Amino acid sequence: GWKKFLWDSEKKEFLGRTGSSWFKIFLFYLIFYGCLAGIFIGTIQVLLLTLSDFEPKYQDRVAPPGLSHAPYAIKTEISFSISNPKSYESFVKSMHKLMDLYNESSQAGNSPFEDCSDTPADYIKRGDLDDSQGQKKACRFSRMWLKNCSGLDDTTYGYAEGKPCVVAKLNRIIGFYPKPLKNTTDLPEELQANYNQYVLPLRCAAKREEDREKIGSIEYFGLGGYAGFPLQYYPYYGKRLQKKYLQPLLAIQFTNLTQNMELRIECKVYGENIDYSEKDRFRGRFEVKIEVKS
């Protein structure tokens, strides 16, 4: 058994068959699998021919935009000691990675960057989503706009003396026009003052009623000094039609933060085409657990 079914010397068989059999089976499987691969490839090519290069056919799973930030928190918590420097390195490294893309050296010349209104403005349509006109042009976004959180003055961005920053960002969506709430009698409390129509407001607060007192002064930095996103940086034409495109950013400094205590801060954007979800905690709003333990 053990030895025979492995190699017999009368019928000159190996594993069961002779030399010519293994060849017949190997050749059959090679031809069969080859046909299988060619058919799968053809059915995938017709697919590639069914889609467009300038626009996703279905855009319903990304209708309400998200709200992400610059620091990379494992459990949406920012905990670091003001003494030990090797505690907030993971934060600064990320922050830096994000801001390192807004360097002025990158934004230079007429192509493909264009100087836009230093004050919030309205939408700008660079035509349709075609290749007729060459690569469209995107507005320039300077670093310095963010005043105390830019890594140009205090590289650390704040984490050095108990005053961290948080760069918020709106998820890039093709052909998405941000629309803000109007001045009618129904509007949240916060939003009344500084109603620049052209600015999408972002406002942070405390999750619980108690934590209010323990959170100090939320100082926002942005385009024009407002706490929002200028409508002029939209819409986004997609990578293919707008490479070298920069999305607005908003810095948030959590000055006067109580020491040695976990604070739950929820930031939220307001607008018409903006809707939140009880399941996705990053759709329109975001949560952060800051704890500057020193």
Binding site: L36, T43, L51, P56, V62, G66, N171, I174
Partner: protein, 993 residues
């Protein structure tokens, strides 16, 4: 419980005297034992009652069903799942509970299967308990000189016991005085006729001597006395029953096939796991992860629903058998009949009816045949001559037996008749084609009768003549044809009378040898009209002197009789032989009768010859002829006792029609073992206790239900509640049909294994988002798939199954490599490709092109990256991309169902085409419809994306698997074509299951 001392042939102390017997056990031949001494022995050794069987609590058999071979594989799978969960819990945070759900599901599957199988075996046990009818019995013992009737459980060794025709022999007795006492030794020794028990000794074999009564035997006619020699379990049938209980069970063929199947499944499972383990370690992954990968691949390669499907498959064929009155106690004993290739049968009670019946009759120099079949379905014997009428009057008058009171309901053949067997058969034949014998008897008053002398060997009697025109007297005598022939001088030919010249005397001699050679017992009936002038109506013929002329009588004709076989016995034997099943007769009856029954049922085909037949046809000694020229052989038990192992092997290896006669139960067991030693499956069909050791050791036992014994009924595996023999043919047919169906269903449940493992393999090697989730694999293996696999059992035959030769056990298996090459190699591959196609389509329509999917799993899984760029530049949060992955799982599962359509259609037939067989199986159609409705329900019902995580699909996706399905159908169709046109070619020895 020494088995060797129980395997030996019975010994005894028969060859002794009445003084030696009374001196060995202690007992007064005329006064018996004393009550004090009787109780001293009763308490000294135990009551005269057989021990009860070894009971069995219900939780024990429930635990038995919870284990086994298949259930054990599922048990190890559940254990592995929980181990991997414990690991993931101690190594990482946010452990997915996928493994725990899969483990509890596997455990539930095993528990449910056990409950169902146990319930079925319990059903059969209850209907089986409704047959043991045990009415207490009391014997007649003589103590201190007085007769008393005490319970059978109070008889001891040494007391005197008296029996009377109609009672049962309590224990093993030693006859001391008898008065024409006959006994029925059919159950123990298998002797069809009543052997007379005489106080004298006659044969060295205790079963052949007449001075010993046996346990469970009944005294037909007469009375006798005897000393209890053996009592309790120490009796003959006690040792036989104890031996039967002390025999092993074995391991059916279906179980061995399932075992080798699990062997292959585990071979390929551990192979894919250890290989992808070394590969994962070669690509960088850590050990902790590689271990989980190994366990995941091994657990993934295990058919969970195949257990319930196989159990239902086997259960379906059992209900049909129960519809035709064929009940199986176990569940796998339904397939053993189809795999049988050598059936060892019993004669008395199984091959025959164990009831004496009038077979042939002689009258008007012509042999006439009578119907000897249970339901009376045959040919009449021309009841138009006067000779027959005179014969009916002779037999109906010169006969003292009468039907037992209150039988007005049963049929003419199954009613109880008080009297001898010959007179009973005669009474039944006359009551059958001559109307009510009670009126035929009251129509002619019997005046004087001279009983049966052992010298006269003839029974005569005179009665009045019912002729209203003739007041004469009628005389009728019956007896052995030679004695009666020497007392006649006339012959009633066609009514008239004629002399007894040597011409008819020689025709009578040839008729006597014709009926005698047929293994029948022939008798002669004659009568004479007494002259009313020499014996007036007033003269009384007292039975003292010669008042009747012994000679010068008128012989009317001979009347033979013998026990006929059951109705469907010849047809069933022929059907079994047609299917290539070797029929070997094994019985403890006389060889002269066994050979005749063998030739009459088909065991010894007409034309074949034995060595003695050749020596008789040539007129030369038997030691000169060569035994190779004889196809059929009759092996005597006495000669079987002195035969080596090789000799028996040669007996079965050179003789095709074998008949073992005068074989003891132990020898029956030896014969069954001699058949197994070679390598063929054996099925023993019997009824008495002598068949218990044969039915137990055989691969499958078939016990009779009405004519069977309780011991052989409890030790058998299949019961024939209707005592029909054609059921054996039905069983051998069903056993095959369900085998080819098991093969088809197995290939069906195994084809889906590939499109359920490939996604994870490409997930680890190519780093793409997980294609097939776990709750979808569960919805496939334990949901939709169940109904179609169950339906595959209802498939009819393709070719004649009762024509092909029996399957070879050493070469043709149940699951070979030809199946694995199809399910795992060709169909499953196409199904996996179709699933991946629908997958890539769903991800390409939402924004993730195939070029950007390779290398994303690290960020596609990360729970803290809320900005994942797609092929177009859009930013997707974590939950949004997860929703798309789940929708891809839903579409993958639906693609599986779509390809399963064509797989169930190509699995319906193994060789034939679909346009030939036809879609006449309504269950399969219902399976397809339900399989589709379930998938649509699981996707479109609200709250499913929350409970099971399955999102709705867009009507354009459902059509991504259709081309693959049609291609599967076309490939298998052309496959099943070259096999037909080219028999024995490459496609056959490579893809023909």
């Amino acid at each position: 419980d020494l088995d060797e001392l129980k395997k030996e042939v019975s010994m005894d102390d028969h060859k002794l005297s009445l003084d030696e017997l009374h001196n060995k056990y202690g007992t007064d031949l005329t006064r018996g034992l004393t009550n004090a001494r009787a109780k001293e022995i009763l308490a000294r050794d135990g009551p005269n009652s057989l021990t009860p069987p070894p009971t069995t609590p219900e939780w024990i058999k429930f635990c038995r069903q919870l284990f086994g071979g298949f259930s054990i594989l599922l048990w190890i799978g559940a254990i592995l799942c929980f181990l991997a969960y414990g690991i993931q819990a101690a190594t990482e945070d946010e452990p997915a509970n996928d493994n725990l759900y899969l483990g509890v599901v596997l455990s539930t599957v095993v528990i449910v299967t056990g409950c169902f199988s146990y319930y079925q075996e319990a059903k059969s046990s209850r209907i089986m308990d409704s047959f043991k009818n045990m009415v207490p019995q009391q014997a007649l013992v003589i103590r201190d000189g007085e007769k008393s009737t005490i319970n059978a459980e109070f008889v001891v060794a040494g007391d005197l016991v008296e029996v009377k025709g109609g009672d049962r022999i309590p224990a093993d007795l030693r006859i001391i005085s008898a008065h024409g006492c006959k006994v029925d030794n059919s159950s123990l020794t298998g002797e069809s006729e009543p052997q007379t028990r005489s106080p004298e000794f006659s044969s060295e074999n205790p079963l052949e001597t007449r001075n010993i009564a046996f346990f469970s035997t009944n005294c037909v006619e007469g009375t006798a006395r005897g000393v209890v020699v053996y009592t309790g379990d120490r009796t003959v049938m006690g040792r036989i029953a104890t031996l039967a209980s002390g025999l092993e069970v074995g391991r059916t063929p279906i179980a061995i096939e399932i075992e080798h199947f699990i062997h292959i499944i585990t071979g390929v499972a551990v192979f894919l796991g250890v290989s992808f383990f070394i590969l994962s370690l070669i690509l960088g992954y850590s050990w902790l992860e590689a271990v989980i990968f190994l366990i995941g691949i091994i657990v993934a390669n295990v058919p969970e629903g195949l257990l319930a499907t196989v159990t239902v498959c086997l259960t379906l064929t059992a209900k049909r058998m129960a519809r035709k009155n064929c009940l199986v106690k176990n569940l796998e004993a339904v397939e053993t009949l189809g795999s049988t290739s050598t059936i060892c049968s019993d004669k008395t009670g199984t091959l025959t009816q164990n009831r004496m019946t009038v077979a042939h009759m002689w009258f008007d120099n012509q042999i006439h045949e009578a119907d000897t079949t249970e339901n009376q379905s045959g040919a009449a014997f021309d009841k138009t001559s006067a000779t027959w009428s005179a014969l009916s009057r002779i037999a109906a008058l010169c006969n003292r037996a009468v039907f037992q009171a209150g039988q007005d309901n049963v049929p003419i053949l199954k009613r109880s008749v008080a009297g001898d067997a010959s007179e009973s058969a005669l009474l039944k034949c006359i009551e059958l084609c001559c109307g009510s014998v009670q009126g035929m008897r009251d129509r002619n008053p019997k005046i004087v009768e001279i009983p049966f002398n052992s010298t006269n060997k003839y029974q005569l009697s005179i009665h009045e003549n019912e002729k209203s025109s003739e007041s004469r007297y009628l005389l009728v005598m019956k007896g052995a044809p030679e004695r009666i022939l020497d007392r006649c001088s006339t012959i009633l030919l066609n009514g008239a009378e004629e002399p007894l010249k040597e011409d008819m005397k020689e025709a009578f001699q040839n008729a006597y040898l014709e009926l005698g050679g047929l293994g029948e017992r022939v008798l002669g009936f004659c009568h004479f009209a007494l002259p009313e002038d020499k014996y007036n109506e007033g003269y009384p013929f007292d039975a003292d002197e010669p008042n009747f002329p012994t000679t010068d009588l008128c012989f009317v004709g001979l009347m033979a009789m013998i026990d006929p076989p059951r109705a469907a016995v010849p047809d069933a034997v022929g059907k079994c032989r047609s299917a290539g099943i070797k029929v070997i007769m094994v019985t403890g009856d006389h060889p002269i009768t066994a050979k005749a029954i063998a030739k009459g049922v088909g065991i010894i085909s007409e034309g074949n010859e034995t060595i003695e037949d050749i020596a008789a046809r040539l007129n030369i000694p038997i030691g000169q002829v060569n035994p190779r020229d004889a196809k059929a052989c009759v092996v005597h038990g006495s000669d079987l006792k002195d035969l080596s192992t090789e000799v028996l092997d040669d007996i079965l290896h050179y003789h095709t029609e074998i008949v073992f006669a005068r074989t003891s139960p132990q020898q029956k067991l030896i014969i069954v073992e001699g058949c197994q030693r070679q390598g063929a499956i054996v099925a023993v069909t019997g009824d008495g206790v002598n068949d218990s050791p044969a039915l137990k050791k055989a691969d499958i036992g078939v016990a009779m239900g009405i004519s069977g014994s309780d011991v052989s009924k409890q030790a058998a595996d299949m019961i024939l509640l209707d005592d029909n023999f054609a059921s054996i043919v039905t069983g051998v047919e069903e056993g095959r049909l369900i085998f080819d169906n098991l093969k088809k269903s197995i290939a069906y449940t195994l084809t889906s294994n590939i499109p359920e493992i490939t996604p994870f393999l490409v997930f680890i090697i190519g780093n793409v988002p997980l294609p097939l989730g776990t709750v979808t694999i569960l919805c496939i293996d334990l949901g939709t798939d169940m109904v179609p696999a169950i339906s595959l059992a209802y498939e009819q035959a393709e070719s004649d199954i009762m024509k092909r030769q029996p399957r070879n056990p050493k070469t043709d298996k149940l699951v070979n490599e030809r199946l694995i090459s199809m399910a795992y190699g060709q169909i499953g591959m196409i199904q996996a490709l179709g699933g991946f196609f629908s997958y890539f389509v769903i991800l390409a329509e939402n924004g993730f092109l195939p070029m950007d999917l390779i290398g994303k799993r690290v960020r596609w899984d990360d729970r803290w990256i809320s900005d994942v760029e797609d092929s177009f530049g859009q930013q997707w949060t974590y939950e949004q991309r997860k929703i798309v992955e789940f929708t891809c799982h839903t579409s993958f599962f639906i693609s599986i169902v779509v390809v399963q359509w064509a797989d169930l259609i190509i699995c319906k037939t193994r060789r034939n085409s679909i346009f030939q067989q036809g879609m006449k199986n309504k269950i399969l159609i219902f399976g397809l419809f339900e399989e589709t409705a379930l998938a649509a329900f699981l996707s479109y019902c609200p709250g499913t994306d929350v409970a099971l995580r399955m999102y709705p699909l867009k009507p354009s996706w459902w059509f991504c698997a259709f081309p693959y399905s049609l291609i599967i159908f076309l490939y298998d169709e052309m496959r099943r074509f070259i096999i037909r046109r080219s028999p024995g070619g490459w496609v056959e020895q490579e893809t023909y299951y």
